[PDB]
Structures are given as structure tokens and as C-alpha cells.
């Protein structure tokens, strides 16, 4: 019952690529970029966590 955020977190730390999030846009709509080592993608959402959730989901699908 773990979320993409915690999954990305756990995987990332195991392979030496702990995810880092950067708030890009806050206009409410938030745009966050997540970076996992060399890989990066963006996600948007109604709240900071919601946006980090989307970014993580995408990076998770791509990586694995």
C-alpha cells in the first residue's frame, strides 16, 4: 500500500538516485520537477504533494 512518492524514494535511495523535487510554478496549480539522478520529469496538481505525486508516478513508470 505504498505511494509512487515513497516507492520512488525507496528505489532511488537503493540505486544511489534519491529523488529531489523542485517547485517550478505556483499559480491553485503547482508544477514540480522531480530529479532521480540523471532522469527528470514534471508533474502538475492542485497541491504541492499532488504535483509531486504525479511527477513521481511518471518517473517511476519510465525508470521501471
Which residue ranges make up each domain of the chain?
1-64
3-state SS assignment for residue 3: coil
Q: Phi, psi at residue 35, to the nearest 5°?
A: -125, 130
Q: Report in angstroms the alpha-carbon separations of 38 from 6, 20, 50.
A: 19, 11, 23
How were these coordinates obtained?
X-ray
- Matching residue, cell 520512488: 8
- Provide the b/e sequence for 6-33 (b: ≥16 CB within 10 Å): eebbebbeeeebebebeeeeeeeebbbb
Instruction: Using the Cα atoms of residue 20, residue 17, residue 50 and residue 25 in order, give the sign of their dihedral.
Output: positive
Q: What's the CA gap between 21 and 10, in Å, rounded?
A: 15
Q: Phi, psi at residue 47, to the nearest 5°?
A: -140, 165
Could you tell me which CATH class the domain 1-64 is placed in? alpha beta
3-state SS assignment for residue 56: helix
Resolution in angstroms comes to 2.1
Q: Report in angstroms the alpha-carbon separations of 57 from 27, 38.
A: 22, 17
Amino acid at each position: 500500500g505504498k505511494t509512487p512518492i515513497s516507492l520512488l524514494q525507496e528505489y532511488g535511495t537503493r540505486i544511489g538516485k534519491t529523488p529531489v523535487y523542485d517547485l517550478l510554478k505556483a499559480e491553485p496549480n503547482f508544477t514540480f520537477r522531480v530529479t532521480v539522478g540523471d532522469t527528470s520529469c514534471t508533474g502538475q496538481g492542485p497541491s504541492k504533494k499532488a504535483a509531486k505525486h504525479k511527477a513521481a508516478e511518471v518517473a517511476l513508470k519510465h525508470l521501471k
